[PDB]
Amino acid sequence: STIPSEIINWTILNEIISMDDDDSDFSKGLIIQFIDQAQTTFAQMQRQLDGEKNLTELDNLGHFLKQSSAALGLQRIAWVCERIQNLGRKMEHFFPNKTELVNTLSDKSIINGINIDEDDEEIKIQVDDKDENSIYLILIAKALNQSRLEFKLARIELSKYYNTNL
């Protein structure tokens, strides 16, 4: 499947533009909660990659954040989390380069002010025929770097539509 080109699904973009004051405050609270959730989630995935390397936990973490991001329309985060899930389940063996995924952005402008590697963490896991999990862990590490960028881009977008720094 292909990563969506828009950061926010148009369903949710319509709601944002149409919401009254009560619904807008409520949705803003949801987003603030999601931001704290995703930062906890990413840091738990990083600690796994650096420590126990439990693929089952990495899968559960991606499953959890796919749902919370998708419910807010943040479909690119959701797509990457789905890759992490399926890599953790050993059902995928591929994760696209950052240049390919950035190139799919429908709005070429949200990149140019940003260091897209700023939130990267070095991938220290080696391919090893004695560790059947090594390849999946390396691809999850790549996907986590993509996630952190998609997360920063989603925050920049949401900040524009809610007129405050989220």
Numbering used by the authors: 2 to 167
Please quote the paper that reports this structure.
The X-ray structure of the Ypd1-G68Q mutant was determined in order to ascertain structural integrity of the mutant and to gain insight into its loss of function characteristics. The Ypd1-G68Q mutant protein crystallized in space group P3121. The structure was solved to a resolution of 1.98 Å using molecular replacement. Clear electron density was observed for the side chain of the glutamine substitution at position 68. The root mean square deviation (RMSD) for all residues between the Ypd1-G68Q and wild type structure is 1.9 Å. The area around the site of phosphorylation is unperturbed with an RMSD of 0.2 Å for all residues in αC and αD helix. The N-terminal αA helix and the following turn (residues 11–21) show the largest shifts in the C-alpha positions with an RMSD of 1.7 Å. The αB helix is extended by one turn (residues 22–26) in the Ypd1-G68Q structure. The αA helix rotates approximately 30° around an axis at its N-terminus and αA helix makes a ¼ rotation around its longitudinal axis. Upon the αA twisting movement, the originally exposed I13 and I17 become buried, while L14 and I18 are now exposed.
Histidine phosphotransfer (HPt) proteins allow bacteria, yeast, and plants to expand beyond canonical two-component signaling pathways into multi-step phosphorelay pathways. The pathway consists of the transmembrane HHK Sln1, the HPt Ypd1, and the RR proteins Ssk1 and Skn7. The HPt protein (or domain) acts as an intermediate in the signaling pathway by transferring the phosphoryl group from the HHK to a RR, which elicits a cellular response to the detected stress. All known structures of HPt proteins share a characteristic 4-helix bundle with a hydrophobic binding surface for RR binding.
